[PDB]
Structure 1
Amino acid sequence: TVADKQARLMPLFKHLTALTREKLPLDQRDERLKGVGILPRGTLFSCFHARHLAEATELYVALYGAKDFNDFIHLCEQARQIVNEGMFVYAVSVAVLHREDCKGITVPPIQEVFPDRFVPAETINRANKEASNHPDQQSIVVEAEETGNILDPEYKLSYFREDIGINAHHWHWHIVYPATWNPTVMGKEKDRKGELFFYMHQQMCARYDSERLSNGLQRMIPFHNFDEPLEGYAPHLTSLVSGLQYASRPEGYSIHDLSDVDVQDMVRWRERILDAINMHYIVDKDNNKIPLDIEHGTDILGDIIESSDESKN
């Protein structure tokens, strides 16, 4: 039944952390993932980075490709063991969302799956500590609220920024509209995904601005200039998977090139995208021009800007 199906899915989600370690007498046994899972857990999975997205897409396709639900579970059983866990959650969630066979099925809570992302390290530490401190069946409750010398007024916004629901939503939205989404492979297409990309993010900003004003703060200003140094933020989040946490960013940093991309390559892209806007057309790979039609224009721009697989160039 559906209920049984739900039950099977929940365990795909349990202990994402611990289900690493190959557990495979001949480690070739998921050849489909000898290629994908070139991310071992070391760094974190990036939703944004292209290479990471490529692996993720490869994973989803296998899940989509699965002939039946049972086959789907089997892939998700054996494969999870190799691939980076973050990528895995990402690929599976996409599969659950789209794949018909999954006409059954919620995904386990993101907050619940990775509590460490939602709550501060201190609270997480305390809970873990209490668990060890006195063994007992009894329940442990920890109040995350803390006590602290709030210097920054940005702190006021924390109710909005830190909100569990907001973060969860953002995770889910990207899952429904993946950047990697290839309509040919799936066959189905996501209507107006580029435009939606634009709208959803715009709303988040708009809503954010209303908070600042409620706060008595001025509206946020764009990162127009790449040269400008960024304001620092320390997340105080730990990752339970290994020894590390999200690195904090101290005050005042000017912009540095990564091996993967130069910030100047970036500046070009901004010029280009905005060029085409004025010129009212964009150039396809074919070197044909497509007009930024009133109907189509936002969608085409959304795909290019994000950018999705859909980008015309």
Structure 2
Amino acid sequence: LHDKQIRICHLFEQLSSATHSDRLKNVGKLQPGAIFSCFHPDHLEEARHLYEVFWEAGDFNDFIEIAKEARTFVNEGLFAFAAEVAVLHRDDCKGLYVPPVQEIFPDKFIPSAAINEAFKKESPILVDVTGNILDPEYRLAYYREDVGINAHHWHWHLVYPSTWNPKYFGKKKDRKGELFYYMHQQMCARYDCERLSNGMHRMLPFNNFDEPLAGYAPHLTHVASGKYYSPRPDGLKLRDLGDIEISEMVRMRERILDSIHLGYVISEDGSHKTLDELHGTDILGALVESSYESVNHEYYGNLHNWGHVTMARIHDPDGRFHEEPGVMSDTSTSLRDPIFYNWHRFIDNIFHEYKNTLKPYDHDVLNFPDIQVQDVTLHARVDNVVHTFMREQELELKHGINPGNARSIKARYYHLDHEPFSYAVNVQNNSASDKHATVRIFLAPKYDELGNEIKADELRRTAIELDKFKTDLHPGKNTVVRHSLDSSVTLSHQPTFEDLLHGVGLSEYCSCGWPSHLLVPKGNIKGMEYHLFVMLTDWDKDKVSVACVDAVSYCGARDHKYPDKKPMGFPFDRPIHTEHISDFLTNNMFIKDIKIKFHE
């Protein structure tokens, strides 16, 4: 298995320099050096043909053999995509990690400037990553450009591929459309908490497709070709591509909004399928993204993914300038671009429209009889205050760019981080028996950037999930203690290439999950006030040998149903009809006011 791990690391090494068999016939279309789009139908189709070949490779040795052959001529982004899907899903690869994508393609995570200087200069090279900041959105560069959030977004879309065919794999990805919704909703809620942390208004939806887009220059090179991700200047409008017209996207949106308000979608055979309470968000995520499991691809289209494609190609809509797409084409770079967030707030508003047709939860669904949460305290250096700060890290570039005779080229970057903290929850169990509880913890900003109080129904768009875990409760008083390091949304550990080649990449071998260091928002130098919300629910009603649950909340569980029956984002997914969230609270719910205080 360590021998297996070594041989997988080798498939991913110097993959920008990597570049036939009847199996490999339908693959080799996209040219090496070109940027691979994780969203355009034709790049994804070639990517599926390749991971199909990898999937039906007779045995491990056969998978490595055919892969090694494919990587000599297929596009290298496509290969890393198809190869990560094979390693995640082949039974004979269980227990193996894939190398970190930021070490496979360092040039997607570090500015051209640091790469050029590292390619400019046998001792270790270190490149530390000046100029007027004239863009106010640069205040959130620490967030959008974080190495770990971009790597998480790459990995999530490969655990939950839009081309997944359950009939082919024999396996269903449980509630994949609903987790498409929730995970992108949580990225929006977390981004808006960073915007309010830095004194900015919450982001507006891109819901009018004639509005000019604001610009973003990525400053990322593609060493494989010397091509770069194309910058987008301020002031261009979406234009028709050869494959898709903007007015066709407007049709897809209208037809989806139509069905939400009628309460049923139309399948391919023309029958009506009701958006029930139980499956409606999943059905909607599949036809919105869209995925293979869309009930009617011809009618509802492919709106979210064509959004990425038209936005990534806006500088060269018909290809006449022969310019590569921008960072919105690729899941490992798209969060860098501000417009990612405006597009996903639009897409989140479609799901929000559907959640608004559902009746608010009543007290019977919210209450857990006999459990009463009596107090929550957050324990940190100062109780009920978390401190955030910037910290330095380095990334090894030698496995992905050509090191020559240097032993190591590292680039140093900085990233937000937070002191460790823990929760103590006091719970009175008034029954004469042991209860089992899921503890659900969320964080929500108290005020907006102009000091107004955010009302209960709007905290649905900004409540971020911090944890979900089972505890047992004995009759009487209980204190539940939980540590931040154990959060069910965060990746606890990514072994580097060097780790996996030696045995220091050491079950929990998947790479999806939120970065530990971005568990909580930045806050600000004064101390920004947040509602800390804790709810306990009856685990015998929630509950649905599991690998890859380190980040269960956002990533689900390997080969396993999503282990919580409640709607994703419960209790905050349905309209709350009460103005102040403190009037929402039931006895098994509690809010403690905390502050988050950034240190400059």
TM-score (norm 2): 0.49
Select the residue among 231, 235, 246 that pairs with 1:263: 246
Query: 2:132 maps to which residue?
Result: 149
Tell me which residue corresponds to 2:34. 43
Q: CA–CA distance in 2 between the matches of 1:291 and 1:108?
A: 43
Which residue of the partner structure matches residue 4 of structure 1? 3
Q: How does 1:65-214 map to 2 (within 5 A)?
A: 65-130=56-121, 137-144=122-129, 147-214=130-197
Deviation at 1:40, TM superposition (A): 1.3
Q: Does 1:238 align with 2:221?
A: yes
**Aligned 8 A contact 1:6 1:106 in 2:** yes
Mapped to 2, the partners of 1:33 and 1:259 lie a distance apart of 28
Q: Which amino acid aligns with 1:18?
A: S
Q: CA deviation at 1:46?
A: 0.5
Cα deviation, 1:109-137, whole Å, max 9, x if unaligned, reads 1100100000000001001100xxxxxx1
3-state SS, counterpart of residue 157 of structure 2: helix
Counterpart CA distance in 1 for 2:289 and 2:34 is 23
Unaligned runs of 5+ in 2: 297-600
Deviation string 1:248-271 (CA, Å, 9 cap, x unpaired) is 000111120000100001100000
1:44 deviates by 1.3
Report the Cα offset of residue 31 of structure 1: 2.6
**Deviation larger for 240-249 or 35-44:** 35-44
Amino acid at match of 2:44: L
- 1:209-252 deviation digits (Å, cap 9, x = unpaired): 00000010000000010000000000000111012100000011
Which of the residues 201, 204, 208 maps onto 1:225? 208
SS in 1 for 2:125: coil
Give how far 1:199 is off.
0.4
CA contact (8 A) 1:33 1:82 kept: no
Say which SS state the counterpart of residue 228 (structure 2) adopts.
coil
Partner of residue 46, structure 2: 55
1:42 CA drift (Å): 5.3
Q: Which runs of 4+ in 1 moved over 6 A?
A: none
Q: Show the counterpart of 1:64.
A: 55
Q: Which has the higher contact order (CA 8 A, sep 6+)?
A: 2
SS of alignment partner, residue 224 of structure 1: coil
**3-state SS in 2 of match to 1:217:** coil
Q: Distance in 2 between matches of 1:89 and 1:57?
A: 12
Question: Is the Cα–Cα contact under 8 Å of residues 51 and 86 in structure 2 kept in the other structure?
Answer: yes
Aligned partners of 1:17 and 1:116: how far apart in 2? 10
In structure 1, distance between residues paired with 2:52 and 2:167: 11
Equivalent runs, 1:247-262 vs 2, <5 Å: 247-262=230-245
CA distance in 2, matches of 1:288, 1:91: 35
> How much has 1:81 moved relative to structure 2?
1.2
Kindly provide the CA deviation profile for residues 51-101 of structure 1, in whole angstroms up to 9, marking residues without a partner as x.
111111111111111111111111111111121111100000011001110
Q: Is the helix fraction higher in 1 or 2?
A: 1
**2: distance between equivalents of 1:299 and 1:36?**
32
Q: Which letter does structure 2 place at the counterpart of 1:112? A: E
- The corresponding residue for 1:14 is 13
One-letter identity of the residue aligned with 1:10 = C
- 1:17 match: secondary structure: helix
1:272 to 251, 255, 279: 255
Which protein has the bigger strand share?
2
CA distance in 2: counterparts of 1:84 and 1:287, whole angstroms: 40
Gaps of 5+ in 1: 21-28, 131-136
**What is residue 26 of structure 1 aligned with on the other side?**
none
Aligned residues of 2:33 and 2:224 also touching (Cα < 8 A): no
Distance 2:238 2:44 in 1: 24
TM-score under structure 1 length normalisation: 0.93
- Number of aligned residue pairs: give it: 296
Give the match for residue 24 of structure 1: none
Name the larger-Rg structure. 2
Match of 2:285 in 1: 302
